[model samples]
Target: GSSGSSGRTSAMLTVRALPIKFTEGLRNEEATEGATAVLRCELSKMAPVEWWKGHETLRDGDRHSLRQDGARCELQIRGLVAEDAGEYLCMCGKERTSAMLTVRAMPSGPSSG
Candidate 1:
């Protein structure tokens, strides 16, 4: 038997999660505690269906809605509050690719500064 009788070519890759991009940045405006704030989150790639929130599982309904159209996901907040400001994420694909969502809160007045 030859030592180099047969050889197999193979390749391996690490499937990394896709990054999210915000087409429109949230304006740095002053709003009341109960004002309607629109937060937009778009992903680099599209998945058939998935959910995400800053590497966390994004729970749907009530105060959150995962809107999807083809390959885009939108995170909508009816009445945004102070607590709503934070880094968020979006996820897609069961395990290969995903997305992220980020929301920033505007400081109200000088005290919050």
Candidate 2:
């Protein structure tokens, strides 16, 4: 009496859900004025993803570039300024992550020797 297999192939539905992960970039970053700030993140599934600043959803602007690939996403801010300092959020489906960016102030005018 030797059974080689269980013979259990009735076709079942499997549920797969993976959490979003931040593989690159820092959660708290600092950049000088006129510099570029890059924030990146990764996800297991290519579900819908969105970036947010405060109560508004961030988008590509004159100084901003948003790039996404499969499971990777990135946000870049060029020509950083003091007004660009704030908390940012990366939302993937029901999962959420955040990062903070701070821009250093620059001198108003040239100093005398």
Candidate 3:
């Protein structure tokens, strides 16, 4: 019995979480000695993020602040000094990224006549 009663067309959809990855990695930043600098990065998945300067661990304080907004992580540093000009490291689980920071200072010139 071959009848033309098969008017059923269906489609399936998939909603799966993609593999954990860094959507946006840390980028190099330049700021003045007295200004503030923020180093930010974004990931596909959220995790306990960590910041480091070379091998030394970086903690939040009066001069440094670390914030997390969903999958985005940021490190804010104020009153930057000459020693702050260096490479920084950010890590989430096994994945990690490195970024460099440059600090420039201009000598004060006499302006008063």
Candidate 4:
């Protein structure tokens, strides 16, 4: 005897985001002087993050900008120089992480006439 009455309710499965956790927190990298530099970091969830360079806080300046993508963040430093090399920080929620950047100067070229 096939039962015509179906009494099972479809379980409500809600998809929720997990707590933000540090994923590929900024990795140390090197760059050539007068080139460009970019530091990257990511998390388990999408959240806003701010970057810091040594004792100074970072912002969208002429040389520096925050080009964040989804749950990841990037600090793009253009017009790089020897002074651009240093430790950078990423404020992730209540915690933070930092990475070192080594800048190298280019070899000498022929002088302008």
On the 0 to 100 scale, the lDDT of residue 101 in model 1 is: 28
Instruction: For residue 8, give model 2's deviation from the true position in Å.
Output: 36
lDDT string for model 1 (1-113, tens) is: 65774578788564556663434332333344565644444444554544444445656687776577644555666666676654454334433332232344555577832
Evaluated with lDDT, which candidate comes out highest? 3
- What is the per-residue lDDT of model 3 for residues 70-102, given as tens digits with 9 covering 90 to 100? 788998888887799888998787788898889
C-alpha RMSD of candidate 3: 11.6
**Model 1 whole-model lDDT (C-alpha atoms):** 0.50
Q: Candidate 4: deviation at residue 73, Å? A: 0.7
> What C-alpha lDDT, on a 0 to 100 scale, does residue 33 get in candidate 4?
82
Cα lDDT tens digits for candidate 4, 83-112: 878888888776688999999987688866
Model 4 regions lying over 4 Å from their true place: 1-18, 109-113
Report lDDT per candidate.
0.50, 0.77, 0.83, 0.80
Q: Assess candidate 4 and give its lDDT.
A: 0.80
Candidate 4: residue 52 lDDT (0-100): 79
Number of the top-ranking candidate, with TM-score as the measure:
3
Residue 46, model 4: Cα distance from true site in angstroms: 0.6
**1-102: candidate 2 lDDT, tens digit per residue:** 897888876984544655655445337888889889887777766667788887888778779998988777888888887877888988777778888888
lDDT of 1 at 6: 56
Candidate 2, residue 41: CA error in Å? 1.2
